[PDB]
Design a binder for this molecule. Sequence first.
Ligand SMILES: *C/C=C1/C(=C/c2[nH]c(/C=C3[NH+]=C(/C=C4\NC(=O)C(C=C)=C4C)C(C)=C\3CCC(=O)O)c(CCC(=O)O)c2C)NC(=O)[C@H]1C
Ligand SMILES: *C/C=C1/C(=C/c2[nH]c(/C=C3[NH+]=C(/C=C4\NC(=O)C(C=C)=C4C)C(C)=C\3CCC(=O)O)c(CCC(=O)O)c2C)NC(=O)[C@H]1C
Lengths: 313, 315
Amino acid sequence: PFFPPLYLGGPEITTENCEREPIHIPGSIQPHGALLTADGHSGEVLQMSLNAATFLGQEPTVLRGQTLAALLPEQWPALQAALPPGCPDALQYRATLDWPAAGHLSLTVHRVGELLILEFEPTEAPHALRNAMFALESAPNLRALAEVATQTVRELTGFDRVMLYKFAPDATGEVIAEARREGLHAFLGHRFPASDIPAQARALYTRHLLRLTADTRAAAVPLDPVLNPQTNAPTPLGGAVLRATSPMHMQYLRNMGVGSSLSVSVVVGGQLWGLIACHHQTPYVLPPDLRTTLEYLGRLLSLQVQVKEALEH
Amino acid sequence: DPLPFFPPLYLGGPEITTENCEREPIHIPGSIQPHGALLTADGHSGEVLQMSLNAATFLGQEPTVLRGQTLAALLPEQWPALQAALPPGCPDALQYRATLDWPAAGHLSLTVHRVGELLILEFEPTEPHALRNAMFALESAPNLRALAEVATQTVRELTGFDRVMLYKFAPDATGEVIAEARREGLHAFLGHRFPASDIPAQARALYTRHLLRLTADTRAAAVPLDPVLNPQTNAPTPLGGAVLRATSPMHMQYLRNMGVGSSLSVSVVVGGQLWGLIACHHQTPYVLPPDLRTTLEYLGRLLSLQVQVKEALEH
Ligand SMILES: *C/C=C1/C(=C/c2[nH]c(/C=C3[NH+]=C(/C=C4\NC(=O)C(C=C)=C4C)C(C)=C\3CCC(=O)O)c(CCC(=O)O)c2C)NC(=O)[C@H]1C
Ligand SMILES: *C/C=C1/C(=C/c2[nH]c(/C=C3[NH+]=C(/C=C4\NC(=O)C(C=C)=C4C)C(C)=C\3CCC(=O)O)c(CCC(=O)O)c2C)NC(=O)[C@H]1C
């Protein structure tokens, strides 16, 4: 099963109970964005991140009464149609708001049962993606495909280190390709145990395909209330990219000397084949539109891995 | 019966009838569609060899001036990028794309690929979260039918085409329309089946390697390359990888007879075989700009993946 989260007086996490940390319900988010939850029917704002006032420019109480209808007039019917009751928690809808306080915000919404989860992040506003797609497809074998993928991602993102991290049948991992800035250790060829990416994280990574830690020294921002009014239970944040990263996992990034980290799941035959895995030495908020490019690349790599593995077997 | 290609018309080959269907060398027509321009150049020196006859009007230069310069001089910023992206021996399927600001012609999209020692350069005029939203909707579709319907509707919304169909191949290479989105008033093609020579054998092989092709105006005359043969080889210039390549006169007649002014399709490729086609029709001529066509190319790949996934959920 899982332990209760901390804020419901559950046990603190060690290296003895790695498999039972409820990484999906931390009750908090990373501070480079803001999150609201809301009722599926009424559009009634039920929870907000204590930092919402910053991003939205709204007097705190104003929000926690109001309706999405009021708050987001153009958007609220689109949401209603895009995310019908009963849809999967994996389905997401995005829009760009030109919002008074903040030039442009990206809005990302998904639905978990009766709750809409809304994420707001700063945003903005060429051929590198098309060029990359063809490059991946003409790679002659899996090894070269891995090399092209890591190089392409590094060029698109500027990340200090990009790796392709492949799982063995027992969930033992192996860096099979790596693109990195001069003057970093090389992780190429190394293997790491199956507990470094525990079971409940690999399950979540099979369904929700992209996660990041923008700053491995930043404090999480609580949800208020912490419990969902609807249920008097924890809000599932598994499909939110703003969800706070497991403190166990930021301590391993800090010990590695990483200040920022991103990963894309590569999913083949319904299973987690591997990860595109990025490091930055310093804090780094990759903007939403560039993340989208990596999300596309994730799908394309998933296709090409199968194609390429089929021409060996 | 499978038989080798006839020589093209310009090398004294025969004209095409319903008899010798499968023998038209559709990849070497010696000509392009008039909404863009094409140059060929030597892959090592960058000497310009062939150009479409309309090139002066896209590029704003006399032929003899174009042909008298190397790509190093014509494309000083792109020439080194081309050479890195398209190394000798690379496959003909690999494409490099850039946007140019050309004085006379505005923003041009440049698409380049390499066939042996030849570079092929295509120039076309070029111009929010719809793709991301579509990607997730496709993935959440519960079964093959719902996927097919979401895919057709999405493509129609992105493009404005009068008709978008998912055309699936059976094992005998007959195809059938399994989903479609269509303009009000058009008759349905849903559930209709069509004989295997409707899209013949030398075209299904090409459609497995080069995944997008179009006919922007089913009545437009093709524009010859000049000279017609590659001076490197005194042989035909391979154009199967060029979206501008002229369309077969046999296929253009079939579309005209159906009342179609513009046609486009993306290949859906599963396990190395051509599974199907995202086929679009428009009743009037219609040019879809290169950046919009890129969205369809990306959806072609997504759909190939999702078709595998939906079919595996099915035994
Ligand atoms: C007691 C549990 C431990 C643990 C937990 C844990 N790990 C993740 C996610 C990841 N762990 C990774 C480990 C590595 N990073 C590397 O660079 C290498 C090798 C070169 C390894 C082996 C990786 C890559 C991930 C994926 C996420 C990412 O890319 O940032 C989680 C889930 C975190 C979350 O969802 O927020 C958890 C709970 N890791 C351990 O090492 C042990 C001590
Ligand atoms: C003897 C010659 C014949 C012939 C040749 C031919 N056909 C193609 C390509 C296509 N034919 C298609 C036929 C259909 N159009 C539809 O709308 C439907 C069903 C609703 C069918 C069955 C299609 C869809 C294509 C693909 C191109 C496209 O999407 O428009 C070619 C190749 C063209 C080229 O590569 O330039 C050729 C040579 N087709 C015949 O029916 C006979 C007359």
